[PDB]
Hints:
This is part of a larger assembly, with 10 protein chains of 7 kinds. Chain A has one helix at 2-5; strands spanning 8-9, 40-41. By secondary structure, chain A is largely without helices or strands. Chain G is mainly alpha-helical. Helix content of chain G is 52%, strand content 0%. Chain G is built from 4 helices and no strands. Chain G has helices at residues 17-28, 32-39, 44-51, 57-62. In chain G, helix 1 crosses helix 2 (32-39). The longest helix of chain G has 12 residues, at 17-28. Chain G starts with 16 loop residues before the first helix and ends with a helix. By secondary structure, chain I is an alpha+beta fold. Chain I is built from 3 helices and 5 strands. Chain I has helices at residues 7-10, 40-52, 83-111; strands spanning 19-23, 31-36, 56-59, 62-63, 70-77. Chain I starts with 6 loop residues before the first helix and ends with a helix. One zinc ion binds at residues 183, 185-186, 190 of chain D. The structure holds one RNA strand. The PDB classes it as transcription/dna/rna.
Amino acid sequence: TLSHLRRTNTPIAKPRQLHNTHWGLVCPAETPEGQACGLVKNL
Amino acid sequence: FIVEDDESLGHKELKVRKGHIAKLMATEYQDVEEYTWSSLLNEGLVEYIDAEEEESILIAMQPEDLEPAELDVDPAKRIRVSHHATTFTHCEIHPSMILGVAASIIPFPDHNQSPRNTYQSAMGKQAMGVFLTNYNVRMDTMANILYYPQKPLGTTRAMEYLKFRELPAGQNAIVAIACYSGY
Amino acid sequence: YDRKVPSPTGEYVKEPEWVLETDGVNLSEVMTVPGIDPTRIYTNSFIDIMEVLGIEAGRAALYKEVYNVIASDGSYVNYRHMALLVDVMTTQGGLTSVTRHGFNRSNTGALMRCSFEETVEILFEAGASAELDDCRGVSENVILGQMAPIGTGAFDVMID
Amino acid sequence: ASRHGQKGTIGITYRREDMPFTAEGIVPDLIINPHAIPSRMTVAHLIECLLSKVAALSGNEGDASPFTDITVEGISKLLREHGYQSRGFEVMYNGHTGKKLMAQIFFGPTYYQRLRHMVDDKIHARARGPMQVLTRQPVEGRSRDGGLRFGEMERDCMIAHGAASFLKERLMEASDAFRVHICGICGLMTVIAKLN
Amino acid sequence: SNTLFDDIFQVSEVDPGRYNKVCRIEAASTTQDQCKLTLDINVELFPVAAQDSLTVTIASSLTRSWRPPQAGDRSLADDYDYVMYGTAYKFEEVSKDLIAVYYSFGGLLMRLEGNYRNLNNLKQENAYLLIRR
Amino acid sequence: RGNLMGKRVDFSARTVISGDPNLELDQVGVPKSIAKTLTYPEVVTPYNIDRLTQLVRNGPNEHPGAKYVIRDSGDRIDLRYSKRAGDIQLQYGWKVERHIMDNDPVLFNRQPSLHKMSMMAHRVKVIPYSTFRLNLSVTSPYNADFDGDEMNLHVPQSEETRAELSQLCAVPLQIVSPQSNKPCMGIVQDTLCGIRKLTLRDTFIELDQVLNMLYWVPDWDGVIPTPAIIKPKPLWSGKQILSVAIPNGIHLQRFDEGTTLLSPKDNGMLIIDGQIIFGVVEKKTVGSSNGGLIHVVTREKGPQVCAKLFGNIQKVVNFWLLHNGFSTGIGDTIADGPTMREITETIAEAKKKVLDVTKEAQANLLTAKHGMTLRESFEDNVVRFLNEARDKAGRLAEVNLKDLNNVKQMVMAGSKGSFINIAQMSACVGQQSVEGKRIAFGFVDRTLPHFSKDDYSPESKGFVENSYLRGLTPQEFFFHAMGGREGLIDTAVKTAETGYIQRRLVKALEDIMVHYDNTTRNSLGNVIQFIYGEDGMDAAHIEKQSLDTIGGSDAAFEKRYRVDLLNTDHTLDPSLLESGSEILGDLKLQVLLDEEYKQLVKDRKFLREVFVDGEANWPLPVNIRRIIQNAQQTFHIDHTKPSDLTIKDIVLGVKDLQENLLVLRGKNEIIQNAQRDAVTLFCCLLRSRLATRRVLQEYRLTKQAFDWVLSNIEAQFLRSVVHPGEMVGVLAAQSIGEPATQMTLKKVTSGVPRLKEILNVAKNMKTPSLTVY
Amino acid sequence: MIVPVRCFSCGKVVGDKWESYLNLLQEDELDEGTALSRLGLKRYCCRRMILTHVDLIEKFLRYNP
Amino acid sequence: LKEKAIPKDQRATTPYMTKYERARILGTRALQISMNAPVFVDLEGETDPLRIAMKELAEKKIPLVIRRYLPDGSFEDWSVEELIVD
Amino acid sequence: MNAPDRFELFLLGEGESKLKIDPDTKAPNAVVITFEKEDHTLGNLIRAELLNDRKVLFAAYKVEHPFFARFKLRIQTTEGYDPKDALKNACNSIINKLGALKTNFETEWNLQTL
Amino acid sequence: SEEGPQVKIREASKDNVDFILSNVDLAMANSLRRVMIAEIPTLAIDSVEVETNTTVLADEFIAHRLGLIPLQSMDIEQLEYSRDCFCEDHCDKCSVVLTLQAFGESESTTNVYSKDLVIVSNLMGRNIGHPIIQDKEGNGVLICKLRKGQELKLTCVAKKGIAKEHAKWGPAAAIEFEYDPWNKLKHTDYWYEQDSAKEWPQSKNCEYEDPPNEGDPFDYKAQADTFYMNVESVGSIPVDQVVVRGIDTLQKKVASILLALTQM
RNA sequence: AUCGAGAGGA
Ligand SMILES: [Mg+2]
Ligand SMILES: [Zn+2]
Ligand SMILES: [Zn+2]
């Protein structure tokens, strides 16, 4: 429940890849798998 | 955390200080004059940083990196590069805060490879557990609740804020890594 | 490229050889250059190889490229399968893609064509054509539900 | 599944007497294969077993927080003070024979979690079932007693195998077989037909 | 039903190898220059020390499922300390006037070379190896 | 596309799969509920009327039962509800829908369905519990693991369909893969590990364990093997029991590294008559690779013997491993302190070298590399230094790891684990790569906000010195997380692309079949191949073998293949052949020998023309060496006596053999020439394998032995010829697709996008390149 | 939710010890491991059941219905 | 096309039974055996139709003629007795 | 759902014979005895005591699947010795040793004071 | 004492007995431990019927707890298994009926213990079905904790059973086994980073056995005739009775084999 | 039925 409450959705040049700007603002490893892997992120 | 020199041309120091930590711990113990996170922000001891603001600043992972450093070392400890950094605008509260709740559940994720951590962050969503205390009163469409939930033997310091110890979702099994009967 | 050639004694020995690798391809100009062996030269691009040297050289280059990708994986696939794919693209004089442009555009079959892609347009074009499907294709028999001309279904068994 | 990305499916359930036992009589609640561990490189699962053994004997909670300098050597020292081996290997005896096992086996308290997926919900079997009206084909899903779908890839696999009759039987007899009447003059099923 | 070869052998060296139970043994024929031997033996059953002199015998016999000795009246064919059974994988000639025999005894390999033996030795799957202290 | 090509099917089930060592390879463990639910119509026969009546009496609730009975009229009779269910009397011609019973054919299918191997016939065995049970060795063709994977089972409804499933789709038949000419299934996981630990000479088996293991082999001769050691104690080598598991009359020769006949390393393997002489069983002998025991047993005896061998090997090895045990543990990842210091100083010297190269770049005293920007050269040098440092630290760890180390045991056996895993857990995980590059500065001039601006040092650039055991710093963890995220994205994107590619290839090649004229043709009759594979032979039964004429020094080839009756030194020794004394002079037999030598020389030139590399081993129909070894073991020649064969007989018989074989039967000059082209390489191989000097030197084959070898070579070739009607196009498309699914992506397009350009024949190319010689 | 009756691995009854364990650690400020030793659970299979247990029953009892 | 007969002597198809041919012959014979077909081979302890079919194939008793087909359409008919099984 | 009942593992059902004796093939005196609803516990002790008897050449230990409780024993004896007699003598010896152990332990406990 | 096995007891307690087995085959000791875990009969609740449940815990949860509760089984041999008895559902000689009624009358939450469970069925003069309390206070195992205004009324039927059918019927919790403590037989090879003696602690059972001699060669005949065991009992059956019943159950199993042979 | 969301395997 807690992780579902902190969820991001990015509709759709390399958004899926973990970015340096994401450090400390997005969890590095929590993401959906297969489809929309990295498109959806957890704060 | 905000880092500025304690004296100009004195050692730069994290603005928070032990006495402030003691007041925070005293306020937390009452559960005097309250000392909150908002109190720290109004004191100017801590600051909120946007990514664009993050670009212009230089931050330090560990508060002990900041204090001045002028032999033998345990071989097991991880190799930490000396920071060699003159200026630090800020210091991170704790590196583990970069991790999410599911990653905070993961034990020793530094010692493990990242893809396995991702798989576990999904599987923890899938795993059973007591979601709420009022489940018996509530009528959800589907609910799975463990008979005898057991708090984890190895706990992250973030788990106390996660309330995972209070509301565990797994059992401390006795597991042997063995080849018995090939099953 | 440390090539290997017969020794004067006879046993195969390796001698280093100088090789040029070019970011660009102008095969007709490059092969007609002094100081190179025009037989040995090979191109990454198979379309140019076929256009300069005919369909068969392009066929060989196509098999070699597929072999290169399978070797980068390290997996091995038998020569007959890759060769069959390359011969499918090669028997038609122009190289035929595995995409709908090509094999699905090829006139053979009607419902077999519409199974892969552009189903409704292929059926429209067939109706305008008034073409006749032999139903000899496996896919067409699958739509028909008739027993497909698979190896087991190919022969006809009758009484003595 | 374990807390370190090791997922698993219960192959078999064993009574305590059959299961291998340490000298103390402790029997593993769960047995995992060693072979899984090398490829995953999930060292932290092994470290969790060691640390939780130390915690259980000491009665003090163990910290597995990342980016905290904790020595496996130090945890091993605490285990040695407890008397259990620094590596956590315990001498085990084969359950059926009582013979001492030749190789000592890593024995530890590991946190494990029960995944939502359970077999009895997953199983579906249909011999004859309801059919969707337009398709005249089997319905979808277990809840409707709906048949599994012979994929296009499955049909390709069957062409590769070469069994025309099985492909036909799954293609027509198993699903949406139908008889229609057509006319020789026009290849269209415009002929009305009273069989009686 | 009689031994094919008998000799006294003095071990030049013992090599444990990676295994701790099984060591390879390099030895030469005593009083004969021609034979030389290299054999896989188990230390735990019988200890082999460097410079030891050991009696070596190869016998054809003395199929049938191995029977535990029914009674003590059934007579051991050897007072030798060590006995092994194996099959030779290849009979070779080192050079003209030199013959080497390669025997695998349950995966424990033994090569012994000398010219005079190959008239005795035969391509026989049966072999009984006898070592006396 | 969907409902007409692929339909939801009745008599279909799906379950989570688990693995049982005791269940046979061809068998599938079908739950009793599934067996009761699924029914097959069996027509009532005079043979089955008693059994069928009993099944109908037993009812749907208990198996063996029957859900429905079908009259001659065809109106259904429901056994669950009927007033007459008790009093049914079977009438001839009725159809009883019997419950799915043991030892029946079904089809077991994995949902990726990339290969014909993914859909294989299995023998039903009704199991109590709920999970589908399958053997371990069948996991690999299915690409299946017991992580919750689900698989589907389809039931035949007609007798002809059952016959097709049993005669073509059965698991033992599908062991040998057409593609890659290798077995699909090999001994995997514990057994593999266990078998190596069983095959060590240090491993010995006591009498009680020997007796139990002897019993565990379901087919046992009943003869206790004579103990390897007798007088000190009746010890048994694990090789002896394992040999009792190996079928008799099967001989394997594998030479690796220093494979001395004394084999001190216990490397390589020699098996004679199903008895192992030397070696420790590693993966390649019990693995899916060519030359393994699986391939040899499948060809020599048959698929059934091979599957039963799978089962027996599994049982014996699992029993012994259960009594020995195994455990990875934390301590097998740890390394000795001195080795860890060496690893750390190796990383430190790599860092010092990188810093020195960086200072050289700053000074602009960097030598120009043609076609390479100087920063590009700096990046390549730093990447190479870090990679070499990680690999060298891994080598130090591997040398440090003892022979008792269980991860080392798994790697030596080949069950699971690699050198890179050892390096990453023990010493250093290395430098993470994003988009084929070191971690870029997402922040301006900084990879991370903690790092200073314009830092190209490896720690800032993402190289993780620390091992998994040591623990990873937060910056290192974030860089590793970026790498892993890219890995997941690449994995999913790859799977999608390979799915589209496989459908394209299958739809393109589905029409192709080998016709009865032996010409590969499409539906319209357009010929793709006049001769399939250009040799006219099935992809199975082909094994790579060495062509002895090609390669080697010319003088050595003459020494091995030239015998001259006129020169005494050239003339064969009289001991080899009884006619040898008679053969001196004999000028006409010598000119026949000269003819054979001229043919061999022309063939050597021809093969050197075919392959510039001149690699000795190429895929070939019949392995001559196996036939020769079988002949030698069958006829038991002491090899001291001269051969009964005459010199003229060898040459004449080889020539007659070459004459006899026809890929295409007919006597037409075009057809005859096409066949001669088809068998030219095989004929060259046969000439290399059987030369007169070779036939009298490599062995003392009797005349009957040479005749038997000739007949067996001919018969094996005839078996190896491709069966007409085989849909080669679909098999080819799947054969490309499955490695492509496994395919994962010096600066050249590789893997899936390069394959996409090749298949699309797209004019634009990401990296055009010309190789000028 | 409530104390397990017995430890899953071996089967020693652990329901009786929970109240005395809580009371012991409260009365004497005792270390948890020493409290388990006084309780008599000398094996970690038994010790995990008491140490890692959570009484959610109190939270359920707090609910009025 | 029609009456595209092939002379018995001039048949070029493979004398060995194709695996598909054996599979279909065995399946058809088993199917007919299930439907009360006469059995031309003496059976000992065999009730499965397929087992009877394989024994009959060994005896070469099956009176079935396979029509080998060619891309041209001309048909070469081979009896089961004539095709060797190996 | 699919799982067998626990009562099945220690109860014989449908009139199953506790011991099924069948003559073994390819060995003269060898016989296979299928112990039904029996576990490893009895089988290992029977096999050990059978190995103790000199006349028994062979005695085996098999469970064909852990799901079902059937213990298979193959016994091969000396000529003139019935394998059934060998198994009976082994069983009798087991009972004597168990009784002696019971008496000795009872005496020791009577000596024990706590 | 007697020819054959001789047992020497290290220590005696009501909960646990530590003993030493001499002149014993290893398979016999393994079989005895497996019988002690599994084969010994014991009485536990096999049916639960609840009329009123206001407890927060579900009825199935409480029934499982009740099944795990120890019930005295010293006289269990007189009691007959339900499957052997001719009663339609339960017989007084077959089954023992317990009743438990607890209401949360107090504002403070009231506990429910095994001492509250009381027996309706006639004892018939056998020590059967008594709830077992090793607790110093005498408070039984806590089945449930009841809020104010909460009541629970249940009836339990306890039947004879064994541990192989269900783990609750097992008399003994843990069996401690040690043989070849010095590893003279070398049945196992120790995993050591540097030296096996340093890494592996010396067992307590080593000191009773004679220390190994480094010059003495390893002997291959030796099968350990000495075993060091400790038995721990729940309390349903006394420790001495636990091991004696294990012995006797093994004897009965062997006798069943023998009589089956005679019938054959 | 339709659409959407989520999840499982690779
Ligand atoms: Mg999976
Ligand atoms: Zn019409
Ligand atoms: Zn316990």
